[model samples]
Target: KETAAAKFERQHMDSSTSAASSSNYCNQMMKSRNLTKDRCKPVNTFVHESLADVQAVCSQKNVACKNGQTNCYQSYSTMSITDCRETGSSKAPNCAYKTTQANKHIIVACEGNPYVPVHFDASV
Candidate 1:
């Protein structure tokens, strides 16, 4: 007869098999295997949890972020606006600012810690 420890060792040691030897191991597996898409759509990176707050702060010109980058609560965040322009032939920097152009555009680059998720990109 196999001992309890032997059985556990055999079952849990087999990485190919699903074994729930310990609650901690199970929790770790769940966390790694179940990562829900973070598609909440971060409109802003701040202490607040809603996008409306970001818009309100932006409208007030109160200081949504520092020079597009937010510095609060030991974390830094940034926001940038880019214009959609055709990629035919234009200035490198001007591409980000083509008022007459109309096309797909996106803003990228963000940083944040556990307190909040930085807004990386916005598409329109």
Candidate 2:
């Protein structure tokens, strides 16, 4: 089984994709990263920061999650990220995404004793 931390890394980490020149970036990445399996992920965010920087977010300001839970934390510094939202015409097995890059403070759910990010909640 994939750990939450591992899953977060696989689905969201994109340290090298600082500048996605291709408009099909989300479409290509969503599939290549295996997020298109079973069904497409409706909305996903890819972080362009280093693993260390991302992990450090767990120690940042605590915040309420979108679901009204108190397990989320917000990044202290603005981070580079790409938001991938499914297009209206997208269908299962043929998922398509609209990619937009932004520099924002990310909110993520943290867990475990080591306190690492498990879920990307939002970017504000």
Candidate 3:
């Protein structure tokens, strides 16, 4: 069964898939995760850290989620990640992305028992 937590992981968590040079990481991962089926996801971020570390944010600084959800929390640690911004010229299954690798405090909305990430709110 695919829980919301699992879906978040599938979409945003990328612990081992990253390489030193990943110009096409977003293009590859976005398609691989089926985020580019019909209309591509305009923007997304991939955290290059362990799920345990990501989940630990739930116990960190509590914050307001973008969608007015109060279940969000911000991580105290700066994590490595890559933001994928869709190129203006791209469309549909051939969606192109620009990767902007960064290190920042990540925020996520947690849910259910043992506390897991449901939505990636923001990276501060």
Candidate 4:
């Protein structure tokens, strides 16, 4: 079975400049990360920071998750990220999205011994 930490990596981590190079980044990435095969994900964000940096977020300042969980943490470092959102008229199997990029602190939910991010709570 895949751990939440590992799944986070596959879906969100993109430490490289795959975005600045392409305006169609989210369109390609959402599919590349398998977010559009079964059902189009309404919204998702890709963090353009190293896996180590994102993993370290679990150890940062404590915060409240969207669900009111105390396991969430806020990154002390502002990270580069791309926000992907399905267009209003987009359909599954041909998911479309609007790309928006930003540099901001991220909030994440984390657990387990290694203490890695399990869910992306938000970006601020």
Query: Which candidate should be chosen as best, given TM-score against the real structure?
Result: 2
Tens digits of lDDT, candidate 2, 1-124: 9999999999999988675667788998899899988898899999999999999988889999999989899999999988999988867889989989889999999999788999999999
Q: After superposition, how far is residue 104 of candidate 4 from its true place, in Å?
A: 0.8
TM-score for candidate 1 = 0.19
- Give the alpha carbon lDDT tens digit for every residue of 4-99 in model 3: 988999999998844325788888888998899998899999999988888888999999999998999999989998898899998798899998
Candidate 1: C-alpha RMSD to true structure equals: 21.7
Encode model 1's per-residue lDDT on 11-108: one tens digit a residue. 22223422233323322332233211232111221121223322222223222333465422221233222222223343322221112212222222
What is the Å distance of residue 6 in model 1 from its true position?
A: 54
Task: Name model 3 segments beyond 4 Å from true.
Answer: 17-20
Against the true structure, candidate 1 has what lDDT? Answer: 0.27
Clashing pairs in 2: none
Which is the leading candidate under lDDT? 2
Comparing 2 with 4 on lDDT, the higher-scoring candidate is: 2
Poorly placed runs, candidate 1 (over 4 Å): 1-52, 55-83, 93-96, 100-114
| Local distance difference test scores for all models | 0.27, 0.91, 0.88, 0.88
Clashing pairs in 4: none
Candidate 2 overall lDDT versus native: 0.91
The best-first sequence of candidates by TM-score reads: 2, 4, 3, 1
* Residue 96, candidate 4: alpha-carbon lDDT: 91
Query: Per-candidate RMSD vs. true structure?
Result: 21.7, 1.0, 1.3, 1.2
Give TM-scores for every candidate, taking all chains together and pairing residue i with residue i.
0.19, 0.95, 0.94, 0.94
| TM-score, prediction 3 | 0.94
